[PDB]
Design a protein around this ligand. Structure first.
Ligand SMILES: *[C@@H]1O[C@H](CO)[C@@H](O[C@@H]2O[C@H](CO)[C@@H](O)[C@H](O)[C@H]2NC(C)=O)[C@H](O)[C@H]1NC(C)=O
Ligand SMILES: *[C@@H](C(=O)O)[C@H](O)C(=O)N[C@@H](CC(C)C)C(=O)NCCCCNC(N)=[NH2+]
Length: 219
């Protein structure tokens, strides 16, 4: 069982994207995890459309640029028969009318799995054995905005009040501190080329294992 995982090195992670000034973190987290599952089951890394989710998934509980949930997105994708490619349905950063096109579908899912709430050992097993995992975190603190390098360690973080969906693409240990390797949606100039190493095995810090999930593909 791996002590260190980095799904970028296996080709399962698209480049870092930028959600701009739209409350669409849930869409970027959902496309990130489904991008991983589609690659790991086909060998093709296909970038998927956050705008498709923002514009079209209101009937599954999402509210576009006003917020949403990754599991709501996975349910919409299942009911819809798929999600368009990023290339065919690119990102505007604003609410739009749904222009989903069946002929431009890049991936599909058949449901989703929620990781046991609060259980970082189960999240570790999912990252290792499934792929990149959608996760919800408390990113409300200025220390998160200003993160540069090393292992983020914010004792003021909440594990109950979560505001930001991101993607767990690996884990490891650095300077004796266990970490989660997390892809953000704030562009590549933020953090470490768009990534952050968050504290692991520090009592579910920032709630990273509180609302973790991934899409199911196939049977
Ligand atoms: C998503 O995470 C939230 C926040 O941790 C979970 O809500 C907590 O669930 C635990 C379950 O043991 C309860 O003890 C807490 O009272 C809940 N907290 C709040 C603030 O409501 C929630 O269950 C998670 N949802 C899913 C689907 O896993
Ligand atoms: C995240 C971001 O853009 O930074 C964005 O604010 C967001 O959507 N946050 C989510 C939680 C994250 C995905 C962890 C959020 O707060 N969603 C609320 C809407 C959930 C759906 N509600 C109803 N009533 N249907």
């Amino acid at each position: 069982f791996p002590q260190t995982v980095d799904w970028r090195k296996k080709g399962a992670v698209t480049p870092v994207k930028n959600q701009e000034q739209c409350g669409s973190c849930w869409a970027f987290s959902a496309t990130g995890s489904l991008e991983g599952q589609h690659f790991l089951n086909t060998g093709k890394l296909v970038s998927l459309s956050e705008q498709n989710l923002v514009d079209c998934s209101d009937d599954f509980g999402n509210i576009g640029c006003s917020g949403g949930l990754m599991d709501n997105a996975f349910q919409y994708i299942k009911a819809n028969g798929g999600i368009d490619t990023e290339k065919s349905y690119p990102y505007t950063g604003e609410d739009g009318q749904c222009v989903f096109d069946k002929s431009n579908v890049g991936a599909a899912d058949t449901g989703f799995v929620d990781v046991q709430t609060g259980d970082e050992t189960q999240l570790m097993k999912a990252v290792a054995s499934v792929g990149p995992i959608s996760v919800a975190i408390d990113a409300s603190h200025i220390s998160f905005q200003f993160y540069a390098q090393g292992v983020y360690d914010e004792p003021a973080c909440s594990s109950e009040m979560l505001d930001h969906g991101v993607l767990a693409v690996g884990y490891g240990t650095l300077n004796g501190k266990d970490y989660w390797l997390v892809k953000n949606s704030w562009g590549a100039d933020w953090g470490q080329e768009g990534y952050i190493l968050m504290s692991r095995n520090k009592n579910n810090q920032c709630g990273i294992a509180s609302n973790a999930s991934y899409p199911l593909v196939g049977h």
